[PDB]
Scaffold this active site. Structure first.
Site, PDB file in Angstrom:
ATOM      1  CG  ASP A 273      14.522 -46.405  80.842  1.00  0.00           C
ATOM      2  OD1 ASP A 273      14.951 -47.195  79.969  1.00  0.00           O
ATOM      3  OD2 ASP A 273      14.718 -45.171  80.802  1.00  0.00           O
TER       4      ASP A 273
ATOM      5  CE  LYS B   8       7.390 -51.471  78.437  1.00  0.00           C
ATOM      6  NZ  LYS B   8       6.534 -50.878  77.380  1.00  0.00           N
ATOM      7  CB  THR B   9      12.385 -55.445  77.255  1.00  0.00           C
ATOM      8  OG1 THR B   9      13.260 -54.594  78.003  1.00  0.00           O
ATOM      9  CG2 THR B   9      11.532 -54.596  76.316  1.00  0.00           C
TER      10      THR B   9
ATOM     11  CG  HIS C  97      -3.600 -44.857  73.404  1.00  0.00           C
ATOM     12  ND1 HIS C  97      -4.161 -44.590  74.633  1.00  0.00           N
ATOM     13  CD2 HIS C  97      -4.616 -44.811  72.507  1.00  0.00           C
ATOM     14  CE1 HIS C  97      -5.459 -44.387  74.487  1.00  0.00           C
ATOM     15  NE2 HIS C  97      -5.761 -44.515  73.207  1.00  0.00           N
TER      16      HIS C  97
END
Lengths: 276, 369
Positions: B12, B15-16, B47
């Site tokens: 949230d 990034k995108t 990860h």
């Protein structure tokens, strides 16, 4: 100013709440740190519930399986979250602990038999309504909300299982993919957890390895039932635990492996994080 | 030059959105290109995904772009975001502080940057020299307010071009050529084909083939690429090497042509290994110690024995861990070299060599087939 900036940073370092929340807390309390901090904590629960509602519905396939053994009671819990980055975070792991302890306390208050072992499960709904430890307040449902507000990810109290054992019975256990976290005494976290309930008159002090090994077998071979010693070996695709090729030596079945140790397997629980 | 970069941070936090803003600005797992290089942008949800990509070599990252929201600032998991970067070998990070662009408060943002640099330093990075760009990914994506949108994205890209170095070719290392095939040229001689793994090869350099009972040594008289006679070849190039005074019978696939006495065969190795799930074509059940699959590396294959770490008695499909492998016989296995493990007619694991420990007495006492 430099002085206000210092107060904001000082409140951040101290409580961990977001910068914007800390800023609103300070201006609301006239720049008084103690009051601001108290204010933030009071809002925490409300903020959490609201955030939990917003994120509710998001996919949570990752998480942890927790195993907590106290005295003759053993509990296995599954708590899910969105990313493995969070499942690796200490804050998340502390929540899992609160869920395990909450389950343990609930169980050590249930049915306690003398002639046989007792087993039980708890669905999401049931686990959620459980009373939070004597430390916190409200239910685990409220603690979950607090964690969701602190980590910003949807989370779910998936399920739990417990087992109580009187003399004459023994519980072998194993958690696979364990995570290091020495601050959570006695708790073991990982991706797979298994409990193997056995009947035996042998001293528990001489069954630790056997117990771990039976657990390893359950994790690695995932049996669908206990089966019987009377049945014949079933090959690498066997479903009955006792007839399955023993994990650490396929030459023999699990029944042939355990029988010699003066131990009979009567039941088991296998938790795989995010399964089904 | 090709560079691999990954975006880490809370979902949230932008990034995108940033990744999309970069896509639209340069249009005037994704791929884009700045003036300087070709970029391979990655954004894995976890990860285990980044580690898998590192081991498999699918998307080995040269650097990370940590995206943090100004309002929240670093999250508790930000710690695990940096531990991961540190673990997969990333030594350079670029930070993008994404804000509610409501022209909020420069002081708050300053504290966010300060905290971030404290964290970066804490995890070994040079927090004081790390480029930290402040802006709004959303404005940049919606072609609005260029000062906070476009400007910040252009600055981020410039910072990535400057702070995230290109992946090394290892041209300083001795040349190593895995022999893929052998053939002759009427009147010229024998030629071995393959792709250089590292270093540089020059028409005339002395060579040596390894992997053969006898140690063969000679000279490279000619280099061939695209049916063109060159005098120099580089790491990564697929070529044909003309060998002096040798017949096809003396060579074969699997041998390794390297700089004279530059490589030392290895039989014992420690490596990071990823075990394939059944869905990825792997096994259904787990494997335990002393499991004997066949290692495939370079252009050779050899049987090996797996030694699980002390304590662990099994390894489950879909898991990655450090293992010790013992080859039935020494082979060309270098540090940083990747390999696969096959049981029968299927791959069950992938690996990356981390160490070449000296073979111990115990390892020598192993009882094979």
């Amino acid at each position: 100013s430099a002085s206000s900036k210092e107060l904001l940073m000082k409140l951040r370092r101290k409580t961990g709440y977001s910068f914007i929340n800390c800023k609103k807390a300070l201006e609301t309390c006239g720049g008084d740190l103690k009051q601001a901090e108290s204010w933030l904590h009071k809002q925490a629960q409300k903020e959490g519930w609201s955030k939990a509602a917003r994120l509710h519905g998001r996919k949570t396939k990752e998480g942890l399986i927790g195993l907590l053994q106290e005295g003759d009671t053993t509990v296995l819990v599954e708590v899910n979250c969105e990313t493995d980055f969070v499942s690796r975070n200490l804050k998340f792991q502390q929540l899992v602990q609160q869920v395990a302890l909450g389950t343990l306390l609930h169980c050590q208050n249930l049915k306690d038999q003398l002639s046989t072992y007792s087993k039980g499960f708890l669905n999401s709904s049931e686990l959620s309504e459980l009373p939070a430890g004597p430390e916190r307040e409200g239910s685990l449902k409220d603690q979950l909300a607090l964690a969701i507000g602190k980590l910003g990810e949807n989370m779910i109290l998936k399920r739990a299982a417990w087992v109580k054992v009187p003399a004459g019975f023994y519980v072998g256990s194993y958690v696979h993919g364990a995570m290091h976290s020495p601050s959570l005494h006695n708790l073991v976290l990982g991706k797979y957890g298994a409990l193997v309930i056995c009947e035996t008159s042998e001293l528990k002090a001489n069954l630790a390895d056997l117990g771990r090994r039976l657990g390893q077998h359950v994790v690695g071979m995932a049996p669908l039932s206990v089966g019987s010693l009377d049945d014949e070996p079933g090959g690498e695709a066997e479903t009955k635990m006792l007839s399955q090729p023993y994990l650490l030596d396929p030459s023999i079945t699990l029944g042939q492996y355990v029988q010699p140790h003066g131990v009979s397997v009567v039941d088991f629980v296998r938790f795989e994080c995010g399964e089904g | 030059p090709h560079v691999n970069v990954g975006t880490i941070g809370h979902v949230d936090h932008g990034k995108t959105t940033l990744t999309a803003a970069i896509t639209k600005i340069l249009a005037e797992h994704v791929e884009y290109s700045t003036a300087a290089r070709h970029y391979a942008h990655t954004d894995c949800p976890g990860h285990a995904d980044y580690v898998k990509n590192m081991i498999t070599g699918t998307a080995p990252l040269d650097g990370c772009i940590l995206v943090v929201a100004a309002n929240d600032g670093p999250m508790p998991q930000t710690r695990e975001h940096l531990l991961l970067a540190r673990q997969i070998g990333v030594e350079h990070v670029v930070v993008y502080v994404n804000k509610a662009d409501a022209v909020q408060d420069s002081e708050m943002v300053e504290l966010v940057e300060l905290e971030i640099r404290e964290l970066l330093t804490e995890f070994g990075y040079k927090g004081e020299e790390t480029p930290i760009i402040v802006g709004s990914a959303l404005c940049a994506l919606e072609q609005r307010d260029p000062e906070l949108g476009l400007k910040s994205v252009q600055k981020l890209l410039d910072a990535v071009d400057t702070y995230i170095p290109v992946p090394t070719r290892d041209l300083e290392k001795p040349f190593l050529l895995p022999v893929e095939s052998v053939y002759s040229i009427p009147g010229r001689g024998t030629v071995v084909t393959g792709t250089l793994e590292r270093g540089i090869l020059k028409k005339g350099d002395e060579c040596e083939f390894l992997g053969h009972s006898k140690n063969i040594r000679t000279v490279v008289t000619g280099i061939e690429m695209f049916h063109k006679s060159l005098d120099r070849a580089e790491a990564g190039d697929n070529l044909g090497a003309l060998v002096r005074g040798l017949k096809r019978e003396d060579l074969r696939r699997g041998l390794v042509m390297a700089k004279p006495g530059s490589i030392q065969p290895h039989q014992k190795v420690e490596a990071q290994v990823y075990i394939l799930t059944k869905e990825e074509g792997g096994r259904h059940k787990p494997f335990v110690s002393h499991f004997m699959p066949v290692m495939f590396s370079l252009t050779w294959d050899m049987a090996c024995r797996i030694i699980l770490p002390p304590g662990k008695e099994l390894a489950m499909p879909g898991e990655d861990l450090k293992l010790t492998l013992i080859l039935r016989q020494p082979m060309i296995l270098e540090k940083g070299q990747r390999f696969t493990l096959r049981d029968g007619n299927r791959t069950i694991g992938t690996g990356l060599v981390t160490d070449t420990p000296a073979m111990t007495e115990e390892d020598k006492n192993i009882k094979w087939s």
